[PDB]
Every structure is written in C-alpha cells, then in structure tokens.
Design a protein around this ligand. Structure first.
Ligand code: U2F
Ligand code: 7E0
Length: 440
C-alpha cells in the first residue's frame, strides 16, 4: 500500500498527488488517498485505482478552516488531531493486512513525517510548488539566509547559478520577504524543510527543462526529483476527455483562440472594488471571456457588472479548467499563477496574463514574464491597486501585441518540453519509474 496525504481540502495539493498515484498504479502499486473525515463525508471518492482512508483535523462535521479562519490556529489543530489520527490509521491499516509501504505527504504537514517514521513507514515528501520558490525557503530553513530574504540575497543566488532569474522586490516570495504580514505561512513554508533530509525520497511537481538551474540545485541539495507536470496522461499525449459541462458548449461556439479564461484560484478572496476593476477590465477588452467566480464570492458581484459581462462573457462558479485550456477557442489565461494553473497553461500552450496575490505567485509571475517569455504580469498602481485599464491593457498586449507571437512561441515551446518530460524516457518519467521500483 502507498498512502497519499495532500494538504486537506486544498485542490492545488490533491490533483497532482492523485496523478502521481495513477502512475504508481500503472506500475503495479496500490494507492490510497488519505483525507479528512469532513472532506470524505462531503466529496465523492476518487475511485479506481484508489482506496480512501480518513484522518481528522478536529472538524469532522464542519469545515475547520471556516471555523478557525486564523491560519496558525487551524494548523495547530490539524497537527494535534491529524498526528493522532494518522498514527491510528497507520496501525489500523497494518492490522487490516494493508501495512503502508510508503507515505507520500505534503510537507506543509511536517508532522506526517514523524508519525510515519515512528510507525516504521518510509516517507516521500511531495512538493507542490516550483523549485525556484522551494529552494529559497530551503535556504532559510538551512540557516544559510536570514529572515527577511531580500532582493540582494536573490541576486547572490542568481550570481551563483542557482536561480535563473534575478528577483526584484515584487518577485521575491512574500512569505519570507515580508514575514510580518503572514507569520503562520512563513513558518509553514520554512518548516517544510525541517527534517526533510530524513526522508527516503523527496519529489517535486515540476520538470527540469522548465527550471533547469533550480531543479538541479534542489536535487543536489535536497535529493528532490522532478515528477511533473503531474497531470492526466491524456493532456501530456502519453498513450500508455470531452465533458457535458455547459460552459464547454459556449466555448464550442467561439472562434479559435478568441477567449480569455479568467480565474484567481480557490483560496484568495477579492473585495467588491477589486472584482469591479477585474470585470470591467474584461468587458473593456472587447474579447470573449469565461470568468470563474466561486460560489462563496459571487454575492460580491453587482447586478450591473453581471449584466455588462453578458454581452460576450460567461461567468461560472467552477469550470473543468484543463478541458478549457485544451480547447481550440481559448486564446489566453488571466490567472493568479498558482503553480497548478501555470503548469496546466504550459501543458496546453496557453499564454498567460499573470495577476499574482501571494505564496509562490509573485515568483512564478516573474518567471512567466522574464525567463519563460510566455506572458506578461499586471502592474499594480503606486498604492497596490489593480486598475481596469491595466487589466485591459495586458489582455490586449497578449492577444494583439507586437509581441503576441513571442508569448505564443514560448508557450508552445514549453508545452512540448513538458510533454516530453512525462513521456516514456523523459526526465520526470524516469524519476517516477525509479520510485515505483523502489517500493515494489
Ligand atoms: O474552476 C476551477 C478552478 C480550479 N480548478 C483546478 O484547481 C486547481 C487550482 O490550483 P492553483 O495552483 O492554480 O490554485 P490554488 O490551489 O489556489 O493554488 C494554491 O496551491 C498551489 C500549490 O501549493 C500554489 O502553487 C498556489 O500559490 C496556491 F494558491 C487547478 O488544478 C485547476 O485546474 C478547476 O478545475 N476548476
Ligand atoms: C490555508 C492554506 C492554504 C494552502 O494554499 C495556499 C498555498 C500554500 C498554503 C500555505 C497552503 C498549502 C496551506 C494554508 C496557502 C496559504 O498559502
């Protein structure tokens, strides 16, 4: 048995780990998704070839995140209850005749390691953020960089050939460049790396052609092996689809490369004025657009703005984002540049307009714009606000610019390297097959 333990609830942690698990099953391993009782009760299971098992974060009936909006407080409770119930699960599983061969875990759950190790179970950390950000956190954890991290430290990393781009103040990861803003997330980001060297394996959802210096450093410093992009094999053109979702039918009616997909992710919240600038920007661009506005956010949307969006947009609460990104009508993606989103754009060859909020997004956005060349980043005004004119300018810059073809050329180029990495003999595929063999 292979246990897979993502950060619970966090869809940006769970899909990639599930896809890695399908490849393990292809090689003969048996994967089990481990998740909270709440999420189990309130979500269909993944299905074959996965078993499911449960632990508790304390809130088996309510959402604990909702209950404990203070993040330090939630993490503390997840740790107390998760660690206890994971220990219980490792024993109950052995007693049922399914002893865990390895626990693959998100090291945003640092406690998972100690519990597995004390139960005698091999451990494999699964990093779901890019090498470039991972390694900076790593440098802090290893006491080679002090907090706060500065553009000067970043420039040393670039000068040493470790980072492939020079990060300015808006590009350094804010959790360690401005730790005061987010104390719990700083500590969580850094503590990923505490004890990592005791792991049997360390894995990262990226591919080495995308971040070659950063992946090489992560490997020689932390034994990190690239196993991504961890996406369904169909999108990767890997031989060894079409849904009925209504928004796909709308998209079927649009001309080729005409549509802007717009999504700011599952976590971040936008206030009314910010939604107003984003949505007016979209309407003002004159492009068709599929704008994802979550159920828990849509009450911030005025009737007027909503009516303006009807002329050539469609607003939905959720879309099948991979399917949309693979669709012929889709011309670019205005994205917060979460890592999962960015990798999905890359595998589909879709150029990006980046509008980062935090975590790894500012750094990712800088790579998009400078090293990868597959898009542009929105420039906030002097006081930190995104204006509708900037949203509109960037959409039009990517879709009608003199550099329209540069963004497309790079996105296509990187699409092909991403597919190669995950096909048989590719750099990521090889690390997957090695891991598979190790535990079979
Ligand atoms: O309508 C929808 C909306 C989303 N999805 C899918 O949900 C996932 C969103 O992941 P992404 O990394 O872009 O956003 P999120 O989990 O906020 O990322 C956090 O977690 C990431 C991983 O640690 C991190 O890089 C990032 O900074 C964090 F914000 C991605 O697989 C989408 O395809 C969808 O299918 N339909
Ligand atoms: C609330 C939360 C959400 C997740 O998604 C976001 C990306 C990393 C992150 C620290 C975490 C894994 C963990 C904390 C998060 C808050 O930043």
């Amino acid at each position: 048995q292979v246990l897979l333990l993502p950060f619970p609830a966090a869809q940006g942690h769970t899909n990639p780990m599930l896809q890695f698990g399908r490849r393990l099953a292809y090689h003969g391993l048996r994967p089990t998704l481990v998740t909270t009782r709440y999420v189990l009760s309130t979500t269909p299971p993944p299905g074959d070839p996965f078993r499911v098992a449960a632990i508790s974060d304390g809130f088996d009936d309510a959402s604990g995140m909702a209950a404990l909006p203070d993040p330090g407080e939630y993490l503390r409770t997840l740790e107390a209850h998760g660690a206890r119930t994971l220990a219980e699960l490792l024993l109950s599983e052995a007693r049922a005749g399914r002893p865990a061969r390895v626990l693959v875990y998100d090291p945003h759950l640092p406690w998972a390691r100690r519990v597995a190790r004390a139960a005698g179970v091999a451990t494999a950390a699964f990093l779901s953020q890019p090498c470039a950000v991972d390694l900076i956190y790593g440098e802090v954890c290893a006491r080679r960089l002090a907090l706060p991290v500065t553009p000067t430290d970043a420039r040393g990393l670039y000068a040493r050939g470790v980072l492939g781009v020079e990060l300015g103040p808006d590009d350094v990861p804010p959790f360690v460049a401005a730790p005061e803003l987010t104390p719990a997330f700083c500590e969580q980001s850094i503590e990923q790396f505490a004890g990592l060297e005791d792991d049997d394996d360390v894995l990262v959802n990226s591919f080495s052609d995308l971040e070659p210096k950063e992946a090489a450093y992560m490997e020689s410093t932390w034994r990190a092996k690239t196993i991504g992009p961890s996406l369904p094999s169909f999108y990767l053109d890997d031989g060894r689809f079409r849904s009925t979702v209504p928004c796909m039918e709308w998209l079927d009616k649009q001309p080729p490369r005409s549509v802007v997909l717009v999504s700011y992710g599952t976590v971040s919240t936008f206030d009314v004025a910010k939604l107003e600038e984003l949505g007016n920007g979209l309407c003002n661009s004159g492009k068709p657009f599929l704008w994802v506005v979550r159920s828990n956010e849509e009450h911030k949307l005025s009737v007027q703005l909503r009516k303006k969006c009807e002329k050539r947009g469609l607003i939905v609460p959720f879309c099948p984002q991979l399917e949309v990104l693979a669709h012929k009508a889709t011309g670019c993606f205005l994205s917060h540049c979460g890592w999962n989103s960015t990798l999905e754009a890359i595998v589909n060859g879709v150029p990006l307009v980046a509008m980062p909020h935090w975590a790894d997004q500012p750094t990712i956005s800088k790579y998009v714009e400078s090293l990868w060349g597959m898009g542009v980043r929105v420039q906030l005004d002097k006081s930190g606000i995104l204006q509708r004119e900037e949203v509109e300018r960037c959409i039009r810059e990517v879709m009608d610019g003199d550099r329209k073809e540069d963004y497309r050329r790079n996105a296509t180029r990187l699409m092909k390297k991403a597919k190669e990495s995950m096909q048989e003999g590719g750099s990521s595929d090889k690390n997957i097959a090695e891991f598979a063999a190790k535990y079979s």
